[PDB]
Each structure stands twice: as structure tokens, then as C-alpha cells.
């Protein structure tokens, strides 16, 4: 047919493809709109027509029903098939939610662009290769969800309820008990500094409600209802949230607040294993799928002219590009000397300096135009780049626009190889890997418009249930930009806090579905891009005495003695909390112990000397460490007795006593090798930190140009939380004219962009996503210069942070991890009890045994033997234990008496089934319960089950203990762990985990030591800090246990902004200096210099230790 040939010619032709691509792109910019005008309706029709034409033009090219089979064989056209079907249905003949379907059109260009379909296809293999670790992750999450459910069932419903005294007449204190104390939130007491209920616990480790507030379980719900441990669904959600570490510290502090501080152990166990280990397993198998597919593709590929003479003679030898790099460095350094309150002459000086720098660059640019050839400038990319910045600078001479000089610092890339490694990464992100980035871009676009069509009217109408008062939420999906922002925040790792609000406004089923799909798919494709970037960038008495001391120092008892003194002295350090003032006996006890310690360590020093020699002593680095610390101690003692004591610097120098635990590093052959292999990689960390400091210098100068001085608030003193209305108070100066009453305080935000240093602090709080909320809120409210912030004026400043997060957090991370990996390779190329652990893992880890047991050949014995052996018996007892698991999942809080009756009956039924299996099994012939470790394991669990049943039988008659039940019942969890015998994936993964826990023990020991040093430092400084955002009555630095809680929390980087926040404040509107402090000190202030030092250094050292050591572990396992 002629129409057949015509349709085929249109099909193969390439102008049709670009026509449909432009049509899709315009339909995209038309989907991304909310509140479309009527002039859009025909446009809809328009698109419909074109797509239908596509359909015809292809099916008329097919021809028949066999051709229709071949056409539908490629699945991609099923999409626009459904698209035109839905179009005809909606245009011929409602819930109004069908409009959400045409976003499928946006996926069409993945099949139209022949490169994108390759990506979205090659991204399918890993998610079905993720199966083994996915079921291991679901299995561990469900195990720990049962554990957490049994431990904390209805614990999060504890509330510091007010005091209720019951009345005689029953059946403003007048009320009813339950209907008033369950649905009444008036009765509860809010947490200090929040509109959030206070939790409590009857235990002596939980929150202590103030006088006048008892503490019960009769409460509304958890925060919005979604953080319960009450059911297995809610508990599985809570443990998923703690696995992804999304706001996990909030659940940590809530649970410890109600359950007790000792359950801290639980949380660390679920972080040291749940978050870290399961997440890292998923990540490592994705990395393995990536390596495998890339090597698979690599294998598939393996299948007047006088004046010309004079000027060219003058420009023969420029030879001064080094002076140009120096002038660039001076230019950035000169731009960096910009701050908030600059004098007029200093501003004029900076302007003249950058003017003369522009002159320098313009002059040598026009010289380089005539130095070689304008075809040379047409040739090289660097020269094009400097030409661009010159034109942009002259445009400046003709807030965002001044910053384009900053790219000049990138000119250092030619001499700073790690900087050009960074730019190679950024050039692959949109170069050789442009398709991955483009796929991610259209996926974020699809998710943004899908979410906005699904949730726009919800977010817009029911906003009253999502914000404080008649006012907007900071995060929503009504506009496309805010939907993109929700998606981007999710990609950053914050999906629970906006999911709560979405489900509060929209609906749990659909919102859960979409946010979990966004998180899974987006984090998967972002990990794909991350890994792809990482892969694309790849007389004799004197001598007699000396040998006497040489004998006295090498004696093992001497070494154990000094180790014990080290440990005792550090433990003595731990006793230095705020309660020594009333501890009179142990005060002087610790005084004498301290002087004994310095004397014994200095005598040890002198004997080391006289034995080994001064050159043999002062060459060892750890001996230098010991000498330095004993020097600290000696000077402290000397100035303590020989006058000039409690004198400023000398009385604050004994704070350095907290370094005393560092003596332990040299002794233990685990910490020593760890610190060796760690400081052996400080040069790489230093050069990468230099590249990151230059990049964040760029971004901090941008933030100082954009909003420096625009972060002030002018809070009203009574309210305190929020700022003020622009209408009423507009300027900082009007904040000082209406200030006839001293309630107005023009405060900055704690972390702002006022210097390059405050810029660096804000960029660290944004790059870790802790504390960035207030940064970005004060930035997208930044109206004027000293002007009061309008609620979302300058809304597009979000872009700044987004861009920074992409270049300063994503790519720099690709830098960090990058060098680390390669660093280790070169170190790869160039505790004896743990060796015995190794040897025993070799010894008793016997895999294949001999013939286990022969048939007893008796009538009953042989029959029971034969019914025990067949694998059908194994699979059915596994089905039985899985049914026990499910009947374990059906337990909730405050369920009912009859249901718990039934559940206890089924409990006895199941322990009976399994103990019958046990009595049949040990009688296999004689030796079933001796050969395999699994049989004796289930033997232990079955006897534990029988003893648990009889303990449940003897609750009160013989002897009673209230809390122990909750843990003996927890032994039932052991039964589900019996499933580890059947599965092969999770068993091998958990065994390879248990093989490496000596290494994790050494790493956790170094981490514990760093926590100990920083706990003592914070006990010295950060006690008496005002109780604010992240420092409550339970997570302090007051005691040592509180310090360990705070520091374990921060070790995951979580909530570190909320703890640094009360260390920064220094003013009367927040602090109270001159406060009658109980100790020698005064004032409840933090000290910003050492607070920033402490927290930034602590999170950076913990990040470095964890990253370095975990990559070492992962490489040594590989």
C-alpha cells in the first residue's frame, strides 16, 4: 500500500522524532503548571492529536495483528498506548484524579531518546539483583521491630500527665477520668521550648516530670500518631526510619525519655548493625552490580606588518602565568575580606582593588588575543573561560552578578591536580555521564509534578492541619517549585518529617506509597550516578644500674601496672562532673589520687629515660605523646603548689588533663595499629580538605555577597520564637526606633553568612543537612540588607543551596570517598587473641560433615528417623515457625483480655509443637543433638521456651518481678532466629559480619576513646550551658553518662546543630551571663570559639574515623 510506505518513511525519518520530542518538552512545561488558564485546554487537545497521530503513524506502519504483536512486544509503547486510551476516555466521557496520569507522557522521551532507554533499562538489573540483601534487610528490620515492639510497646504513649484526684460522685477539676485524660491535651505538659508533649517513665532512668505532674500512659498518640512502637506496622516504620537515619535522634531521645537511658544500648545495637550494616550491604551489592555491568560493557566492546613583527617580538616570552596565578590567589583572598559591618574606606579599598584586578585581567586578556592568534583564543577552553569572565567583569562595571569573578580561582586547577580532579568529576556529571544526570532530572521532574497533581488541593485546602495558624507550610507541593523542593529534600535524606505532614493532609495509603517510591527510586538512581561518577574518575656499676632499669621496665608486671594506672586515672577523670561540689570525701580522694598519678607517671618517665637513652626516648612518637601529657601534669602541679595558682591560663590549662586517656593508645596493640593506619592517610585527607576549603570559599563568598547582614531578625522578646512582621517593623533601624520598650532584639541567626568563616560554618551545617533548615529559612526570607525578613521574599534563593548541595556536598563527597579508595589501594599495593579468633573461625567452622546418623532400623525408631530426615519435614517446621512469627506480629498495645488469652493458648500450642519436634529429633538415633550447632541452638531455645512458659505459669504465686517478664518473653524472638538455619543469603551475610567484629571492636574502641576525651572536655566547658534546643535535662554535658549520650548521638552527625546551638549564644536575649553559677564559673553561656572547635572537630574526626575504617573493612573483605 502507498499509505504503508508513507507511514514507514515518516517513521524512520528523524524530523518526526524531534517533533515529538519538542511536543513532549512543551507538554512538560505545561504539566508543571498549577492553576492553568482556559487558553490551556485547547493545548491539551493539541497534544492529544499529535500523540494519536504518532499511534497511527506507527500502527499503520505495523500493518496487522501479527504486526501488532511485534509492535507491542517492545514494552515502551504500552505507555503512550495507555496515554491515548486515557485521553480518549477523559475527552469523551469523575474523581478529578485522572489528570495525574498524563505525566506518563514525560516518560515517552526516554524511549524517544535512544540513549535514555539504555539507562533506564540498565538500571533494572540491580534492583532484581538486590533481592538477597533486600530480604535480609526486611528480615532484620522485622526481627528488630518485634524486639522494639516487645520492649517499647506503648512506651511512646507515656506522657507527663497533670495531677488527677478522683472524686466520690462518679458513674475545674471536675471531669471524667479516661475521656478527659486521653483526649485532653490540656492535661499534658509540653516539653520546654516546644509545643510537644513531654515523655516520662516510672523507671529511674527516664524523664522526671516536675512537681505537680505525674506520668501515665493515658495519652493521645505519639507525635502525629506515626512514631508508635505499638503495632508491628508502626514499629517496622520506626525501624525503617532508624535504618535510614532520618531524624533518628528524635526517636532516640523520645524512647530514652520514656523507656530509660539504659535502652541506649538498644539504639546503638540497631545503628552499629541496622543502619550502618544493612545500608552498607545494599550499597555494596549495588556497587557490585555497577562494577559487573560496566565490565560487561567493556567486554562487549572487546568483542602595519612591521607592527605585527614588533608586537610578536614583544610577546615572545610571556613567562608570567605564575604571576597570574598569584594575582588570582590575591584576588580571591582580597574578595574574601568582605564582612557585615565594613567601614566606608574599607569598602572603597576593596572596590578599587577588584577594579585594578579587572584591569590586570582585561589587559593580559587583550594581550593574549594579540600574543598568538584570535584563532588560539578560538581554540583553547581555558582561554575561552577567561574571556567569558572578562566579559562578565566588564558587565559588572556596566547582588548575584558580582560573584562571577570567583570562577577565576578555578584557574588554579592547572597547577593543583586535585582541583582538576574535581572539575573532571563535574565535567563527567554533564559530559560522558550526561544521560544519567538527565534521567535523574526528568525523574525528579516526574516525581514533582506527580506529587503536585496528587497532593496540591490537599496541601492547599487542609493547610490548617499542617501549620501553626492561618499561614503556609515551609514545605508543600502546591507549586511546582515547592514540589521539586520536597523531592530534592527527600533525595537529601529527609522524607519522614514531610511525610508526616503529607499523610496529615492527604492520606496514609497514597502518601506512604508515593513518598516511599520516591525515596527508593530516587535514592537508587542517585546512588547510581554517585557510583558512576566514582567509577569514571578511576666503673660498670652505672651500666649495671642501667640494665637493672632495663629489666624493671621490660617486666610484664610493670607494663600491666602502668596500664592499670592509665585506666584508673582516666576513670578518675570521669568522676569530674558537676556533683563534686557536694562530694566532699571523693574530692580530696581524687586530689591525692591525682598527685599520686603525676608522681608515678613522672617516675616512669625517668626510668624510661635512664634505661633507654634520650635519643631512643625522644624519637618515638608515642613517647613524645607521653612526655607531653606528663609535662602538662607536672606544670599543673608545680603552679598549683609554687604560687600563681587558680590564675587564668594556668587554671584553664588543667582542662587539658582530659587528654590523659590518650596514653592508652600506645599500649593496646589494636588502637595502636588503628591510629597508625589512620594517620598514615592524613596527607590525602589534607589535600582533599584543601580542595573543599577552596570550593567552600567560593560558596561562602557567594553567600556573603547574597545575604550578609540580611539574616537578622528583630524578634520580639515575649514571643521569642518568630521574628516580626515587615509591615510593622521594617528596617533594623525601625527595630531601634520602636525599641522604647526594650523587648525588641535585632538578633542574627546563630549560623549566618557574615564572614567567610561564618560562611564555612553555615556550609558545614548545610552540607551535613543538620541545621540547614534555619539557614535556608533565613535565606529565602532575606528581603533587604538590614531589613526585616518577609516570609518568602527571595524564594528562589533556595536555588543557591540546592546548587551548593549539588557541587559542595555531592561532588566534593565524590572527591573525598574517591581519593580514600585509591589511597587505600596504594597502601594495599606497597590483637593476637583476635588472631586466635581467626584460627578458631578456621577450626570449628566445619562446613561439610560425614554421614550424620544411620537409621536405627527399629519399627518406631526407623519410622521416626525417616519422617524426620526428608526435607519436607524441614520445610513444614519452617512454615510452622513462620506462622509463629506472624502470630508474634499480631500483638499490639492494650489489645484485649480475650485476644491475649487466645494468643497465650497459641503460644503454648507452638512451644508444644516445637518441643515435640525436639523430643522426636534428639531421638533420631542417639546423636542428632550433638553433631550440628544448629540442633543444639534450637535445643537451647526450646528449653528456654519451656522455662519461659513455666515462668509465665509462676508469675505471682511463688515470686514476682515486674520488668523481667518483658525480657524473658523476648526470648521467644529466638524462635524466629531459627529461620537463619534455612536461608542461605542472610546466614552468609551475618557470618561474614561476625567474622569482622574484632575489627569493628577496635574501631568502636577508638571511637569510644574519642568520645571519652570529648566527654571530659565537654564536662569541663559545656556543663552549665543553658538548656536549649538539643540540650535537655537528660542529654547534657553535666554528668558523664549524659555526655556519652550526647556524643553517641553526634557520632552519627545527627542533631549536632541542636547541640552546637546553645553553645553559640552569648547574649542577654538568649543567655544570662552574670548568672549565680554553683561552680567557680558564672553565667549559663556557651563559648562560641571552643564550641565551634569542639563540635566541628568532633563530627569531622568521627566522620573521618568511621569512613576511613569502614572503607578499610570493606576493602579487606574484598
Ligand X SMILES: COCC(CCO[C@H]1CC[C@@]2(C)C(=CC[C@H]3[C@@H]4C[C@@H]5O[C@]6(CC[C@@H](C)CO6)[C@@H](C)[C@@H]5[C@@]4(C)CC[C@@H]32)C1)COC
Ligand Y SMILES: CCCCCCCC/C=C\CCCCCCCC(=O)O[C@H](COC(=O)CCCCCCCCCCCCCCC)COP(=O)(O)OCCN
Ligand Z SMILES: CCCNC[C@@H](O)COc1ccccc1C(=O)CCc1ccccc1
Q: Indicate whether 1097 belongs to the interface with ligand Y (CB under 6 A).
A: yes
Question: Angle at CA 782, nearest 5°, toward 779 and 787?
Answer: 145
Helix (H, G, I), strand (E, B) or coil at 744: strand
Which of 678, 744 has the CB closer to ligand Y? 678
Q: How many CA atoms, within 13 angstroms, populate the side-chain half-sphere of residue 1069?
A: 18
Separation CA 454–CA 993 (nearest Å): 43
Binding window for ligand NAG (CB under 6 A); candidates: 343-351, 659-667, 736-744, 851-859 = 736-744
Q: Under rule CB under 6 A, which residues in 5-34 are in contact with ligand Y?
A: 29, 32-34
Is the CB of 324 or the CB of 1101 nearer to ligand Z?
Answer: 1101
Is position 297 an interface residue for ligand X (rule: CB under 6 A)? no
Distance of closest approach, residue 1007 Cβ to ligand X, in angstroms: 12
Q: How far is the CB of 1098 from ligand Z (least distance, A)?
A: 11
For ligand Y, which stretch binds (CB under 6 A), given 313-321, 370-378, 513-521, 851-859?
513-521
Q: How far, in Å, CA of 176 to CA of 166, rounded?
A: 9
- Which residues does a chain break follow in the chain (C to N more than 2.5 Å)? 93, 171, 303, 398, 538, 830
Q: Which of positions 1050-1079 make contact with ligand NAG (CB under 6 A)?
A: 1068, 1073-1074
**Cβ 562 to ligand Z shortest distance, Å:** 33
Residue 280 binds to ligand Z (criterion: CB under 6 A) = yes
Looking at residue 210, the DSSP 8-state letter turns out to be P
Q: Which three cell numbers stand for residue 521?
A: 527510586
Grid cell listed for 22:
519538542
Comparing CB distances to ligand Z, the nearer of 150 and 1053 is: 1053
Local structure of 188: helix, strand or coil? strand
The answer to whether the CB of 420 falls within 8 A of the CB of 414 is: yes
From the list 183, 295, 652, 737, which residue makes contact with ligand Y (rule: CB under 6 A)? 652
**SS3 state at 162:** strand
Q: Does 737 bind ligand NAG (CB under 6 A)?
A: no
Residues from 238 through 267 that contact ligand Y (CB under 6 A): 240
Contacting ligand NAG within 547-586 (CB under 6 A): none
Look up residue 957 and give its three cell numbers. Answer: 504465686
Q: Tell me phi and psi for residue 34, to 5 degrees.
A: -105, 155
CA distance 1103 to 1108: 8
User: Is 752 a binder of ligand Z (CB under 6 A)?
Assistant: no
Q: Pick the binder of ligand X from 817, 971, 977, 1104 (CB under 6 A).
A: 817
Within 745-764, the residues that bind ligand NAG by CB under 6 A are 745-746
When binding is defined by CB under 6 A, the residue of 291, 591, 736, 874 that contacts ligand NAG is 736
Q: How many CB atoms lie within 10 A of CB 701?
A: 23
Question: Closest CB to ligand Z among 280 and 739?
Answer: 280
Residue 280 binding partner per list ligand X, ligand Y, ligand NAG, none, with a CB distance cut-off of 5 to 8 Å that depends on partner kind: ligand X
Report the partner that residue 55 touches, choosing among ligand NAG, ligand Y, ligand X, none (CB closer than 5 to 8 A by kind): none
SS3 for 954-995 is CCCCCCCCCCHHHHHHHHHHHHHHHHHHCCCHHHHHHHHHHH
> Taking CB under 6 A as the rule, which mask of x and - marks residues 979-1018 in contact with ligand Y?
------------------------------xx-xxx--x-
* CB 265 to ligand Y: min, Å: 11
CA distance 563 to 566: 5
In the set 912, 1089, 1116, 1117, which binds ligand Y (CB under 6 A)?
A: 1089
Q: Which of 22, 151, 67 is nearest to 965 (CA)?
A: 151
287 makes contact with ligand X (CB under 6 A)? yes
537 binds ligand X (CB under 6 A): no
Distance separating alpha carbons of residues 1024 and 1036, to the nearest angstrom: 9
Using the rule CB under 6 A, is 643 a contact of ligand NAG? no
Assess 807 for contact with ligand Y (CB under 6 A).
Answer: no
Binding to ligand Z, residues 1080-1109 (CB under 6 A): 1102-1103, 1106-1107
Q: Cβ-count burial of 774 within 10 angstroms (0-12 exposed, 13-18 middle, 19+ buried)?
A: middle
From the list ligand Z, ligand NAG, ligand Y, none, which binds 739 (C-beta under 5 to 8 Å, kind-based)? ligand NAG
Rank residues 745 and 1048 by Cβ distance to ligand NAG and give the closer one. 745
Instruction: Report, in Å, the least distance between residue 163 CB and ligand NAG.
Output: 5
Answer yes or no whether residue 761 interacts with ligand Y by CB under 6 A: yes
The separation between CA 452 and the C-alpha centre of its own chain, rounded to angstroms, equals 27
* ∠ Cα 134 139 141 (to 5°): 95
How far the first Cα of the chain sits from its last, in Å, is 62
The set of residues, in sequence order, having a beta carbon less than 8 Å from that of 1048 and lying 6+ positions away, is 264, 268, 1011
Q: Which does 287 bind (CB under 5 to 8 A by kind): ligand Z, ligand Y, ligand X, none?
A: ligand X
Contact with ligand X (CB under 6 A) among 74, 91, 196, 291? 291
What is residue 213's three-state secondary structure? strand
Contact 1099, 1076 (CB under 8 A): no
C-alpha cell at 917: 519436634
The residue whose grid cell reads 493532609 is 505
Tell me which residue of 640, 645, 659, 652 sits closest to 591, measured CA to CA: 640
Residues between 540 and 569 that touch ligand Z (CB under 6 A)? none
Q: Build a one-symbol-per-residue string for 467-506: x at contacts with ligand Z by CB under 6 A, - elsewhere.
A: --------------------------x-------------
Chain positions 1046 to 1085 lying near ligand X, rule: CB under 6 A, are none
- Report d(CA 916, CA 894) in Å as an integer: 32
Question: Could you identify the residue written with the cell 543567655?
Answer: 1071
- The interface partner of residue 1068, options being ligand Y, ligand NAG, ligand Z, none and the CB cut-off 5 to 8 Å by kind, is ligand NAG
**154 vs 493, which CB is nearer to ligand Z?**
493
Smallest separation, CB 1101 to ligand X (Å): 17
Quick one: 1101 or 1111, whose CB is closer to ligand X?
A: 1111
Smallest separation (angstroms) from ligand NAG to the CB of 744: 6
With beta carbons less than 8 A apart as the criterion, state whether 1060 and 1092 touch: yes
Site for ligand NAG in 203-232 (CB under 6 A): 212, 214
**Which grid cell is 674?**
588503628
Shortest separation between residue 1117's beta carbon and ligand X, angstroms: 3
Residue 856 phi/psi, 5° resolution? -70, -10
Closer to ligand Z by CB, 249 or 626: give it: 249
Residues in the chain: 1118
| Dihedral pair phi/psi, residue 1087, rounded to 5° | -115, 115
Please report how close the Cβ of residue 672 comes to ligand Z at its closest, in angstroms. Answer: 23
Task: Write b or e for each residue in 461-471: b if 16 or more Cβ atoms lie within 10 A of its Cβ, otherwise e.
Answer: eebeebeeeee
Rounded to 10 degrees, the C-alpha dihedral 540/542/547/549 comes to 160
Determine the interface stretch with ligand Y among 281-289, 355-363, 822-830, 960-968 (rule: CB under 6 A). 281-289
719 is an interface residue for ligand NAG by CB under 6 A: no
Is residue 208 a contact point for ligand Z (CB under 6 A)?
no
Q: Which stretch binds ligand NAG (CB under 6 A): 542-550, 735-743, 865-873, 1051-1059?
A: 735-743
Whether residue 1068 contacts residue 1087, with contact meaning beta carbons closer than 8 Å, is answered with no
Which residues make up the interface to ligand X (CB under 6 A)?
276-277, 280-281, 283-284, 287, 291-292, 295, 530, 534, 817, 821, 989, 992-993, 996, 1000, 1110-1111, 1113-1114, 1117-1118
Which residues make up the interface to ligand Z (CB under 6 A)?
245, 279-280, 493, 1052-1053, 1102-1103, 1106-1107, 1110-1111
Which residues make up the interface to ligand NAG (CB under 6 A)?
163, 212, 214, 736, 739, 742, 744-746, 1068, 1073-1074
Amino acid at each position: 500500500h502507498p499509505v504503508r510506505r508513507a507511514a514507514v518513511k515518516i517513521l524512520v525519518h528523524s524530523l518526526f522524532s524531534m517533533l515529538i520530542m519538542c511536543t513532549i518538552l512543551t507538554n512538560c512545561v505545561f504539566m508543571a503548571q498549577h492553576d492553568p488558564p482556559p487558553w490551556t485546554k485547547y493545548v491539551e487537545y493539541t497534544f492529544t492529536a499529535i500523540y494519536t497521530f504518532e499511534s497511527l503513524v506507527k500502527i499503520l506502519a505495523r500493518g496487522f495483528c501479527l504486526h501488532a504483536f511485534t509492535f507491542l512486544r517492545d514494552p515502551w509503547n504500552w505507555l503512550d498506548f495507555s496515554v491515548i486510551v486515557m485521553a480518549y476516555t477523559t475527552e469523551f466521557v469523575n474523581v478529578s484524579a485522572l489528570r495525574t496520569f498524563r505525566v506518563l507522557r514525560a516518560l515517552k522521551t526516554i524511549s524517544v531518546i535512544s540513549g535514555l532507554k539504555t539507562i533506564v533499562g540498565a538500571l533494572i538489573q540491580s534492583v532484581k539483583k538486590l533481592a538477597d540483601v533486600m530480604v535480609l534487610t526486611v528480615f532484620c528490620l522485622s526481627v528488630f521491630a518485634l524486639i522494639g515492639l516487645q520492649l517499647f510497646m506503648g512506651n511512646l504513649r507515656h506522657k507527663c500527665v497533670r495531677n488527677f484526684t478522683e472524686l466520690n460522685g462518679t458513674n475545674g477539676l471536675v471531669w471524667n477520668s479516661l475521656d478527659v485524660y486521653l483526649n485532653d491535651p490540656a492535661n499534658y505538659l509540653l516539653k520546654n521550648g516546644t509545643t510537644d508533649v513531654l515523655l516520662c517513665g516510672n523507671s529511674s532512668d527516664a524523664g522526671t516530670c516536675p512537681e505537680g505532674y505525674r506520668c501515665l500512659k493515658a495519652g493521645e498518640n505519639p507525635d502525629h500518631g506515626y512514631t508508635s512502637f505499638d503495632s508491628f506496622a508502626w514499629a517496622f516504620l520506626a525501624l525503617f526510619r532508624l535504618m535510614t537515619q532520618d531524624c533518628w535522634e528524635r526517636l532516640y531521645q523520645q524512647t530514652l525519655r520514656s523507656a530509660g537511658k539504659i535502652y541506649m544500648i538498644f539504639f546503638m545495637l540497631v545503628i552499629f548493625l541496622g543502619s550502618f550494616y544493612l545500608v552498607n550491604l545494599i550499597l555494596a551489592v549495588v556497587a557490585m552490580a555497577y562494577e559487573e555491568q560496566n565490565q560487561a560493557t567493556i567486554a562487549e566492546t572487546e568483542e602595519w606588518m612591521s607592527i605585527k613583527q614588533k608586537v610578536k617580538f614583544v610577546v615572545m616570552d610571556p613567562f608570567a602565568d605564575l604571576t597570574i596565578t598569584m594575582c588570582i590567589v590575591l584576588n580571591t583572598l582580597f574578595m574574601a575580606l568582605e564582612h557585615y559591618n565594613m567601614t566606608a574606606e574599607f569598602e572603597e579599598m576593596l572596590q578599587v582593588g577588584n577594579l585594578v584586578f579587572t584591569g590586570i585581567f582585561t589587559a593580559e586578556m587583550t594581550f593574549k588575543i594579540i600574543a598568538l592568534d584570535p584563532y588560539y583564543y578560538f581554540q583553547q577552553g581555558w582561554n575561552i573561560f577567561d574571556s567569558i569572565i572578562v566579559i562578565l567583569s566588564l558587565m559588572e562595571l556596566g547582588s548575584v552578578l558580582r560573584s562571577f569573578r570567583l570562577l577565576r580561582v578555578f584557574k588554579l586547577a592547572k597547577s593543583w591536580p586535585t582541583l582538576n580532579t574535581l572539575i573532571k568529576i563535574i565535567g563527567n556529571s554533564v559530559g560522558a555521564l550526561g544521560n544519567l544526570t538527565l534521567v535523574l532530572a526528568i525523574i525528579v521532574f516526574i516525581f514533582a509534578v506527580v506529587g503536585m497533581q496528587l497532593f496540591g488541593k490537599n496541601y492547599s485546602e487542609l493547610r490548617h492541619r499542617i501549620s501553626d495558624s492561618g499561614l503556609l507550610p515551609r514545605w508543600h507541593m502546591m507549586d511546582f517549585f515547592h514540589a521539586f523542593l520536597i523531592i530534592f529534600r527527600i533525595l537529601c535524606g529527609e522524607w519522614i518529617e514531610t511525610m508526616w505532614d503529607c499523610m496529615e493532609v492527604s492520606g496514609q495509603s497514597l502518601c506512604l506509597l508515593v513518598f516511599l517510591l520516591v525515596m527508593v527510586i530516587g535514592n537508587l538512581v542517585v546512588l547510581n550516578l554517585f557510583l558512576a561518577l566514582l567509577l569514571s574518575s578511576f666503673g660498670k656499676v652505672w651500666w649495671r644500674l642501667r640494665k637493672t632499669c632495663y629489666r624493671i621496665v621490660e617486666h610484664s608486671w610493670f607494663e600491666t601496672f602502668i596500664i592499670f594506672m592509665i585506666l584508673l586515672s582516666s576513670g578518675a577523670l570521669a568522676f569530674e562532673d558537676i556533683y563534686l561540689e557536694e562530694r566532699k570525701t571523693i574530692k580530696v580522694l581524687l586530689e591525692y589520687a591525682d598527685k599520686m598519678f603525676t608522681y608515678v607517671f613522672v617516675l616512669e618517665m625517668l626510668l624510661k629515660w635512664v634505661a633507654y637513652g634520650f635519643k631512643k626516648y625522644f624519637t618515638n612518637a608515642w613517647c613524645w605523646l607521653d612526655f607531653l601529657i606528663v609535662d602538662v601534669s607536672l606544670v599543673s602541679l608545680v603552679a598549683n603548689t609554687l604560687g600563681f595558682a587558680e590564675m587564668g591560663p594556668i587554671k584553664s590549662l588543667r582542662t587539658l588533663r582530659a587528654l590523659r586517656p590518650l596514653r592508652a593508645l600506645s599500649r593496646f596493640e589494636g588502637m595502636r595499629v588503628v591510629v597508625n593506619a589512620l594517620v598514615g592517610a592524613i596527607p590525602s585527607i589534607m589535600n582533599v580538605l584543601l580542595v573543599c576549603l577552596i570550593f567552600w570559599l567560593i560558596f561562602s563568598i557567594m553567600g556573603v555577597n547574597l545575604f550578609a547582614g540580611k539574616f537578622g531578625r528583630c524578634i520580639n522578646q515575649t514571643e521569642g520564637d518568630l521574628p516580626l512582621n515587615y509591615t510593622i517593623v521594617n528596617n533594623k533601624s525601625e527595630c531601634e526606633s520602636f525599641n522604647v520598650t526594650g523587648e525588641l532584639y535585632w538578633t542574627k541567626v546563630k549560623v549566618n553568612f557574615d564572614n567567610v568563616g561564618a560562611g564555612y560554618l553555615a556550609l558545614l551545617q548545610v552540607a551535613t543537612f543538620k541545621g540547614w533548615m534555619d539557614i535556608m529559612y533565613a535565606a529565602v526570607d532575606s528581603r533587604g540588607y538590614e531589613e526585616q525578613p518577609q516570609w518568602e521574599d527571595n524564594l528562589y534563593m533556595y536555588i543557591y543551596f540546592v546548587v551548593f548541595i549539588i557541587f559542595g556536598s555531592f561532588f566534593t563527597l565524590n572527591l573525598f570517598i574517591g581519593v580514600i579508595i585509591d589511597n587505600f589501594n596504594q597502601q594495599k599495593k606497597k590483637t593476637e587473641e583476635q588472631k586466635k579468633y581467626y584460627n578458631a573461625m578456621k577450626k570449628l567452622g566445619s562446613k561439610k560433615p560425614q554421614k550424620p546418623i544411620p537409621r536405627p532400623l527399629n519399627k518406631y525408631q526407623g519410622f521416626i528417623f525417616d519422617i524426620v530426615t526428608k526435607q519436607a519435614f524441614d520445610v513444614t517446621i519452617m512454615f510452622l515457625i513462620c506462622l509463629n512469627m506472624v502470630t508474634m506480629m499480631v500483638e499490639t498495645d492494650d489489645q484485649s483480655p480475650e485476644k491475649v488469652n487466645i494468643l497465650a493458648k497459641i503460644n503454648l500450642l507452638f512451644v508444644a509443637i516445637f518441643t515435640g519436634e525436639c523430643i522426636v529429633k534428639m531421638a533420631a538415633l542417639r546423636h542428632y543433638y550433638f553433631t550440628n550447632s544448629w540442633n543444639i541452638f534450637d535445643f537451647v531455645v526450646v528449653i528456654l521456651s519451656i522455662v519461659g512458659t513455666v515462668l509465665s505459669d509462676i508469675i505471682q504465686k511463688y515470686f514476682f518481678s515486674p520488668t523481667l517478664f518483658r525480657v524473658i518473653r523476648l526470648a521467644r524472638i529466638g524462635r524466629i532466629l531459627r529461620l537463619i538455619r534455612g536461608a542461605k543469603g542472610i546466614r552468609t551475610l551475618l557470618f561474614a559480619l561476625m567474622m569482622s567484629l574484632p575489627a569493628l571492636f577496635n574501631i568502636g574502641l577508638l571511637l569510644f576513646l574519642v568520645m571519652f576525651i570529648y566527654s571530659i572536655f565537654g564536662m569541663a566547658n559545656f556543663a552549665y550551658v543553658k538548656w536549649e534546643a538539643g540540650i535537655d535535662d537528660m542529654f547534657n554535658f553535666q554528668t558523664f553518662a549524659n555526655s556519652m549520650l550526647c556524643l553517641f548521638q553526634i557520632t552519627t552527625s545527627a542533631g549536632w546543630d541542636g547541640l552546637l546551638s546553645p553553645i553559640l549564644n552569648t547574649g542577654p536575649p538568649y543567655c544570662d551571663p552574670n548568672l549565680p553559677n554553683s561552680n567557680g564559673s558564672r553565667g549559663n553561656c556557651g563559648s562560641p570559639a571552643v564550641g565551634i572547635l569542639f563540635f566541628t572537630t568532633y563530627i569531622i574526626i568521627s566522620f573521618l574515623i568511621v569512613v576511613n575504617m569502614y572503607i578499610a573493612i570493606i576493602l579487606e573483605n574484598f
